Design a binder for this molecule. Structure first.
Ligand SMILES: CCOC(=O)CC[C@H](C[C@@H]1CCNC1=O)NC(=O)[C@@H](CC(=O)[C@@H](NC(=O)c1cc(C)on1)C(C)C)Cc1ccc(F)cc1
Length: 180
């Protein structure tokens, strides 16, 4: 109950359908006008968000003290909307999970929840040939169209879906300091 329920609350207040020139993605709204996307979505100066065109004030590929690719892009949106601040639900350190749910919301895959099970430490990932770090893995057959999906455990927001090989899926881990 509490876990699936947490995922459903997040969907409504913080998860949005977007489209870039690279296709359809799920977006996590983090706080106020700040959101996060998979880097592969390559957001431009304008993005579609639930059937409206929105100006992008800033977009930054995420960097930290390790100086590694993390497969995420932070964006600040030129919008009236202010996301409820969910940073307190993001752990300070990358966190695995026993019973995670992947929350997907795109125009093609609207408002869906997928129990992916265990989310385990994985680390380095060559993602279609691009070196990527700080990933976690689930033994679930994730699909094209699910990138940006939000990986949650009860009371915690732990990852963003970025890739998979047909049998397993991979997320970029989330840490609170990314959003400081
Ligand atoms: C084009 C449509 O794009 C999307 O739908 C975005 C979401 C999908 C979801 C995948 C889609 C499939 N099962 C999934 O879960 N992600 C990708 O396709 C990514 C590539 C893979 O997942 C690669 N997997 C690995 O490398 C990989 C490595 C190991 C280990 O496991 N997977 C491809 C071989 C599938 C897209 C990408 C390409 C170049 C990059 F710089 C970085 C990312």
């Amino acid at each position: 109950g509490p876990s699936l329920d947490f995922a459903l609350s997040l969907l409504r207040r913080n998860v949005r359908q977007v489209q870039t020139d690279q296709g359809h993605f799920t977006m996590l709204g983090v706080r106020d006008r700040l959101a996060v996307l998979p880097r592969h979505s390559q957001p431009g100066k304008t993005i579609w968000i639930e059937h409206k065109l929105v100006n992008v004030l800033d977009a930054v590929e995420l960097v930290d003290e390790q100086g590694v690719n993390l497969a995420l892009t932070l964006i600040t949106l030129d919008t009236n909307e202010k996301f409820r601040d969910i940073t307190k639900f993001i752990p300070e350190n990358i966190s695995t999970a026993s019973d995670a749910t992947l929350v997907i919301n795109t125009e093609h895959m609207p408002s869906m929840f997928v129990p992916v099970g265990d989310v385990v430490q994985y680390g380095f990932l060559n993602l279609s040939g691009k070196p990527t770090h700080r990933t976690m893995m689930y033994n679930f057959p994730t699909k094209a169209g699910q990138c940006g999906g939000v990986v949650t455990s009860v009371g915690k927001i732990i990852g963003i879906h970025i890739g998979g090989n047909g049998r397993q899926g991979f997320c970029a881990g989330l840490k609170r300091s990314y959003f400081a």
